[PDB]
Design an enzyme around this catalytic site. Structure first.
Site, mmCIF file in Angstrom:
data_model
loop_
_atom_site.group_PDB
_atom_site.id
_atom_site.type_symbol
_atom_site.label_atom_id
_atom_site.label_comp_id
_atom_site.label_asym_id
_atom_site.label_seq_id
_atom_site.Cartn_x
_atom_site.Cartn_y
_atom_site.Cartn_z
ATOM 1 C CE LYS A 1 2.603 -1.379 7.131
ATOM 2 N NZ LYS A 1 1.737 -0.453 7.915
ATOM 3 N N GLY B 1 0.821 -1.213 0.000
ATOM 4 C CA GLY B 1 0.000 0.000 0.000
ATOM 5 C C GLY B 1 0.852 1.258 0.000
ATOM 6 N N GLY B 2 0.909 1.937 -1.146
ATOM 7 C CA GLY B 2 1.675 3.173 -1.285
ATOM 8 C C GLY B 2 3.161 2.967 -1.041
ATOM 9 C CB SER B 3 5.572 4.992 0.815
ATOM 10 O OG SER B 3 5.278 6.016 -0.120
ATOM 11 C CB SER B 4 4.240 0.511 3.671
ATOM 12 O OG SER B 4 2.846 0.624 3.454
ATOM 13 C CE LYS B 5 7.412 -2.665 -2.788
ATOM 14 N NZ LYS B 5 6.104 -2.737 -3.503
ATOM 15 C CB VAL B 6 3.350 -6.509 4.777
ATOM 16 C CG1 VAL B 6 2.087 -6.705 3.949
ATOM 17 C CG2 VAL B 6 3.477 -7.567 5.875
ATOM 18 C CG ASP C 1 -10.753 5.345 7.079
ATOM 19 O OD1 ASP C 1 -11.799 5.902 6.669
ATOM 20 O OD2 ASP C 1 -9.989 4.688 6.334
#
Ligand SMILES: c1nc2c(NC3CCCCC3)nc(Nc3ccc(N4CCOCC4)cc3)nc2[nH]1
Length: 264
Positions: free
Chosen positions: A39, A20-25, A133
Site C-alpha cells: 500500500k 482509493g483517494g490518496s492511496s494505492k495498493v 463503518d
C-alpha cells in the site's frame, strides 16, 4: 515495468490491485519472487489530523497482528514526511468482489467466514477500537480465511480494472440517529451475513436514498427474514439487526451462539 524500495528491499510491481483517494495498493514480487501487496499512501496534501489518523492505523495494525491471525499481516512498513509504504500479505480477493461473483454462497463456507469475521472484530474491540463503518470490502480472503485489512479510519478503496449496494447499506441506525458502541459493528457484520444468506442487504430494495436512512432508524419498519434450513442463522440475523443496541446481541454472545458452535 515499475519497481519500488521499502526498508532496503526491492519489490517489482506486477499490477495495481486498486486505488482509493490518496492511496494505492499494488501486487508485488520481492527479491525471491514471493508475492506481497504494498500500500502506497501519498501524504503531500494530507492535513495534520489526516496524518495522525494514518499513523494510528499503522500503529494498531502493527500491534494487533501479534494477537490474532484474522487481522491482515503487515510484514514491514516505511514512513516519511511525504509517503507511506506498507508491505502486507497478499490476498486472493476482497469479500465484496467475491460476493458480487457468487450468486449463491455455500452454507458451510458462509458459516466459516462468519466465524473468521467475528474473531477479527472481537480482537479490535478488545484493544478499544470500534470500526463503525464496516463493509464486506474491509475483509480479505487469504487462503480460504477472511482477514481484516482496513480499520475504517480514512478509506476510499475500490478495485481498479453490477455495483448493486450503496455506501449507506451496512450502516448502523444509531450512527444515523447520532445527528459509539461495539454493538454498532455487530449491526454492520449482521448485514454482511444477511447479504451472504439472502443475496441482498436489508435495505437494498429501497429506491430513494433520502428515505433509506429514515427506514433504517424507524422502529415501525420490519426487516424480512424468509425461512431457511439453518434456524440458527435466522436467529443470528434477527439478533444482529435488532435496532436498539442494549438489546442487540454482543460479539461474545455471538461466539457462544449455536450457529458458530454447533456442527451440521
Ligand atoms: C492487502 N491489502 C490487499 C488488497 N486490497 C484491496 C484494496 C482495493 C479494494 C479491494 C482490496 N487486496 C488484495 N488482493 C486482491 C486481489 C485481487 C482483487 N481483485 C480481483 C477481483 O476483481 C477486483 C480485483 C482484489 C484484491 N490483497 C491485499 N493485501
Amino acid at each position: 515495468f515499475q519497481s519500488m524500495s521499502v526498508k532496503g528491499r526491492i519489490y517489482s510491481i506486477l499490477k495495481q490491485i486498486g486505488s482509493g483517494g490518496s492511496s494505492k495498493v499494488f501486487q508485488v514480487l520481492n527479491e525471491k519472487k514471493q508475492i506481497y501487496a504494498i500500500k502506497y499512501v501519498n501524504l503531500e496534501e494530507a492535513d495534520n489530523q489526516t496524518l495522525d489518523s494514518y499513523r494510528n492505523e499503522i500503529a494498531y495494525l502493527n500491534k494487533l497482528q501479534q494477537h490474532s491471525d484474522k487481522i491482515i499481516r503487515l510484514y514491514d512498513y516505511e514512513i516519511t514526511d511525504q509517503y507511506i509504504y506498507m508491505v502486507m500479505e497478499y490476498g486472493n480477493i476482497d469479500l465484496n468482489s467475491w460476493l458480487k461473483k457468487k450468486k449463491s454462497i455455500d452454507p458451510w463456507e458462509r458459516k466459516s467466514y462468519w466465524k473468521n469475521m467475528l474473531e477479527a472484530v472481537h480482537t479490535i474491540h478488545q484493544h478499544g477500537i470500534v470500526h463503525s463503518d464496516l463493509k464486506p470490502a474491509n475483509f480479505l480472503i487469504v487462503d480460504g480465511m477472511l482477514k481484516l485489512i482496513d480499520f475504517g479510519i480514512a478509506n476510499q478503496m475500490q478495485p481498479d480494472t453490477d455495483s448493486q449496494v450503496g455506501t449507506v447499506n451496512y450502516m448502523p441506525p444509531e450512527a444515523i440517529k447520532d445527528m459509539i458502541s461495539p454493538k454498532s459493528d455487530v449491526w454492520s457484520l449482521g448485514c454482511i451475513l444477511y447479504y451472504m444468506t439472502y443475496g441482498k442487504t436489508p435495505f437494498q430494495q429501497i429506491i430513494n436514498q433520502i428515505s433509506k436512512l429514515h427506514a433504517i432508524i424507524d422502529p415501525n419498519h420490519e426487516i424480512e427474514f424468509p425461512d431457511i434450513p439453518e434456524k440458527d442463522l435466522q436467529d443470528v440475523l434477527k439478533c444482529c439487526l435488532k435496532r436498539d443496541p442494549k438489546q442487540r446481541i454482543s460479539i461474545p454472545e455471538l461466539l457462544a451462539h449455536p450457529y458458530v458452535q454447533i456442527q451440521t
